[PDB]
């Protein structure tokens, strides 16, 4: 493990790799109480133990807390100059898209007030949509909140298009489908899981609550932590409960009648699962409060693998695109740790 300190007065809230855009996949953003900081990951000589070190590049000041953070495919590099596009959520309950050239915010769009969410925003994600001619036609941001609303915010050539959709319960996560921006997934706090075609009722709703194996009772309150697609065509869906209970469904052949596989993490997962970018069957989950991280294999290859235990709480974490490195933001730092097995 190598450890890189965040500035002394910087409290991290969120950590994400720029896996969404290959030109910028070595860029790391930390949303904190005064903005979003960008770091670069480089192969040093090091020892080929952790043959990867972190270089802090710069800090984008915003003046208020950043709670969720997503890079877009529009990110680019030039010589040098970084052209960034970031979706995030701020203390004023607004959802924003910030477009920068390095630390300087050259452009900012803000969706808030009554036109925005009418309660706390719980999650956000972003994807670039191109026309048939293949110019940038739209950038699309999806967000979910405690106002029982899902918001699709499309920024198009002739300007913004806003749309709201009602939910049976607070939205706790949302993510567009890989290799198919026409589809996306929305998570409700109550266990409902929506598959949605925004170009169009919405196509499908699964639910983890009634499926709990109950060989070991998952408890009275098993609030849904997370749902994410897996695979590079978005061939699968993985859902994780706060309790640690997880379930996986695949989407291809024949007729289907239950979720394909199911299990339970050793610990609660407040932050939910972070699926491996290269190995579908694998995902990571943290015991954020004691600072341990379990690695789970869906086809039970795993047998309780806990590669990571810190002596401190974990605020957030995410896989580097290479699949062997992990970046983890803790309350005062970010660690890059390399698991030798995944190399």
């Amino acid at each position: 493990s190598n450890q890189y300190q965040l500035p002394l007065n910087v409290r991290p809230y969120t950590t994400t790799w720029c896996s969404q855009s290959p030109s910028c996949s070595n860029l790391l953003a930390i949303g904190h109480d005064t903005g979003i900081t960008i770091y670069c990951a480089s192969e040093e000589q090091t020892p080929g133990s952790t043959g990867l070190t972190l270089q802090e590049l710069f800090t984008i000041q915003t003046g208020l807390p950043t709670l969720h953070l997503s890079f877009s495919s529009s990110c680019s590099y030039s010589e040098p100059v970084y052209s960034l596009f970031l979706a995030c959520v701020c203390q004023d309950n607004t959802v924003r898209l910030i477009i920068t050239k390095n630390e300087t915010i050259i452009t900012q769009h803000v969706l808030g007030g009554k036109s925005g969410h009418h309660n706390f925003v719980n999650d956000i994600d972003i994807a670039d949509v191109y026309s048939a001619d293949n110019r940038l036609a739209e950038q699309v941001i999806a967000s979910v909140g405690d106002d029982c609303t899902l918001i699709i915010w499309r920024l198009t050539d002739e300007g913004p298009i806003l749309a709201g959709y009602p939910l049976s319960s607070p939205g706790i996560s949302v993510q567009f489908r890989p290799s198919n921006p026409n589809q996306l997934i929305v998570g409700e706090r109550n266990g409902n899981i929506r598959i949605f075609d925004w170009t169009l009722p919405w196509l499908l709703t699964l639910n983890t609550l009634p499926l709990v194996n109950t060989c070991h009772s998952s408890g009275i309150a098993s609030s849904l932590a997370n749902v994410r697609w897996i695979g590079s065509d978005g061939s699968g869906i993985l859902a994780m409960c706060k309790s640690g209970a997880w379930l996986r469904w695949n989407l291809f052949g024949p007729k289907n009648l239950l979720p394909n596989v199911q299990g339970i993490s050793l610990f609660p997962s407040l932050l939910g699962a972070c699926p491996h970018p290269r190995y579908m069957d694998y995902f990571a989950t943290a015991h954020s409060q004691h600072g341990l991280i379990q690695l789970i294999n869906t086809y039970e290859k795993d047998s309780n693998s806990i590669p990571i235990q810190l002596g401190m709480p974990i605020v957030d974490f995410c896989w580097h695109q290479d699949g062997s490195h992990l970046a983890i933001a803790t309350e005062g730092s970010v660690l890059l740790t390399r698991l030798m097995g995944f190399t």
Partner: protein, 416 residues
């Protein structure tokens, strides 16, 4: 299923799983429980403990703030609650209990005291007494008839009378019994541990007639004016006389209850026969045998039955209603037999749901509302759902069995 189950834990709203006002009286409840209505329109509940050493009283409509009274007994009753009676005489709960050693204990609990704040009781609230020698001929069933009179039933088959002269003392008024003379036959002995045809159920009719059901399902009828056996019906020789097996009832239970002049009796043939005739003058006259609808082998036991005036059911064609409570382990079954007409030949069985909605939803994972997520969230969820009495009893059973919460997020614990 026309009825549903609503479960009530009278302490559910409060944190303390026990009333602050509990008083323990001492004489020099998970085996029986019942309710009794009093002069003041209030229901008093009572419980006789597993050992039959503790009697507990508490007010149905004020369990938490009202007083629960634990009366401790020097020893257990001869034969559980079956050797115990409780009736409201005059502004008092009169409780009599034949104890194991033979003593006949009287309790007098003033109505006031049951609904007072007091933790003390004045005057003679209990009397010990030895009216008969129960060492030789052991009794097993005590039946209240009147404030001064009530009969005792014996294991060997004999009846004893018990007449109150003053206010306290009791004396044996014996009944004529020549049933014993069947000993003369090669098929019965006085000395035999079998052969007893003891009473297993008993009801008082029109203050004077005492209707008894025996282990061989004979309905004998005693006139208390005469103190003489007036009737003796063999209940079983009416329906299909099965030589294979009629289960002579091997314990005291609730095998009959009467309303006006009607009388249902529970006979065991695969545990499934409700005979019901009519009483009239004294004469008992058969009408019909109504079987039961029970399967999975028929392994339900009668808990209690109550014949009574008809209900408001989905069938207007009704004359009488029998409420029936079966049990099989800790699972229960409530049914209502509706008899349509004064002939007991047209009837219909009405079932009910024997689990509450909350329980069914929890079992079948049909609960969409309860918040999910945190391990402590599940804690609040279960705590709030179950109530403190149960939740703490469960946490008691956990630590006894050495199951201890590892950390904040021990999901393996919550499961348990």
């Amino acid at each position: 299923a026309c009825l549903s189950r609503i479960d009530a834990n009278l302490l559910q709203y409060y944190e303390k799983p026990e009333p602050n006002n509990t008083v323990d009286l001492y004489v020099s409840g998970s085996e029986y429980s019942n309710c009794l209505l009093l002069s003041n329109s209030e229901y008093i509940c009572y419980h006789f403990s597993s050992r039959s050493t503790l009697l507990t009283f508490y007010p149905l409509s004020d369990a938490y703030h009202g007083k629960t009274i634990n009366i401790h007994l020097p020893n257990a009753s001869m034969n559980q609650r079956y050797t115990l009676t409780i009736q409201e005489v005059e502004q008092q709960l009169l409780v009599n209990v034949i104890l194991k050693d033979g003593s006949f204990l009287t309790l007098q609990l003033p109505l006031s005291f049951l609904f007072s704040s007091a933790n003390t009781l004045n005057g003679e609230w209990f009397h010990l007494q030895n009216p008969y020698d129960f060492t030789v001929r052991v009794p097993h069933f005590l039946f209240y008839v009147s404030p001064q009179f009530s009969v005792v039933f014996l294991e060997d088959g004999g009846l004893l009378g018990l007449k109150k002269v003053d206010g306290v003392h009791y004396e044996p008024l014996l009944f004529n019994d020549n049933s014993y003379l069947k000993s003369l036959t090669r098929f019965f002995s006085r000395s035999s541990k079998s052969d007893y045809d003891s009473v297993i159920s008993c009801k008082l009719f029109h203050e004077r007639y005492l209707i008894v059901l025996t282990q061989n399902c004979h309905l004998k009828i005693w006139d208390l004016t005469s103190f003489t056996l007036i009737q003796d019906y063999d209940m079983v020789s009416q329906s299909d006389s099965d030589p294979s097996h009629f289960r002579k009832v091997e314990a005291v239970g609730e095998y009959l209850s009467l309303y006006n002049n009607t009388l249902v009796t529970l006979l065991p043939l695969e545990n499934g026969l409700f005979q019901m005739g009519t009483l009239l003058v004294l004469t008992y006259t058969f009408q019909n045998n109504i079987p039961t609808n029970l399967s999975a082998s028929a392994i339900w036991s009668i808990v209690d039955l109550v014949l009574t005036r008809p209900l408001e059911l989905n069938v207007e064609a009704s004359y009488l209603n029998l409420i029936v409570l079966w049990k099989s382990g800790t699972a229960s079954k409530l049914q209502i037999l509706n008899v349509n007409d004064e002939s007991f030949k047209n009837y219909e069985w009405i079932e009910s749901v024997n689990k509450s909605l909350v329980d069914l939803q929890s079992e079948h994972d049909l609960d969409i509302v309860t918040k999910t997520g945190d391990v402590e969230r599940g804690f609040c969820n279960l705590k709030s759902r179950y109530g403190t009495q149960i939740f703490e009893r469960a946490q008691q059973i956990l630590s006894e069995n050495k199951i201890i919460m590892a950390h904040n997020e021990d999901e393996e614990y919550l499961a348990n």
